[PDB]
Amino acid sequence: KKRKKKSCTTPKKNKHKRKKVKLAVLKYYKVDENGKISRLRRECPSDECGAGVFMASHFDRHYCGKCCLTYC
Template sequence: MAAKDYYKVSGNSIERANQFCPRCGEGVFLAEHKDRRSCGKCGYTEFKK
């Protein structure tokens, strides 16, 4: 994904489209899957309910 796909711009505000990894910190996004969110760097996984 390109960097522009990680953010949403509306007017003068910028919002993150995905969450940051709680282990790696800001700058490393969690990938969105159908049933989970996962970090490609450290392997952290959150399962959706």
């Protein structure tokens, strides 16, 4: 027997393309004229995610991308 093609489905299921963000580090901190640094993004309460692993400021929740911890 020979293989039939039968090539007809949903036209194209596209693969997710990751967003390109330029200098995402900067938006985590705010700076005053005196030289102070204030951390805009909350720091996760987990063990590993304690100092530099910031959370996500979603419109109705806080989400840590490294351990999937979620808060209201």
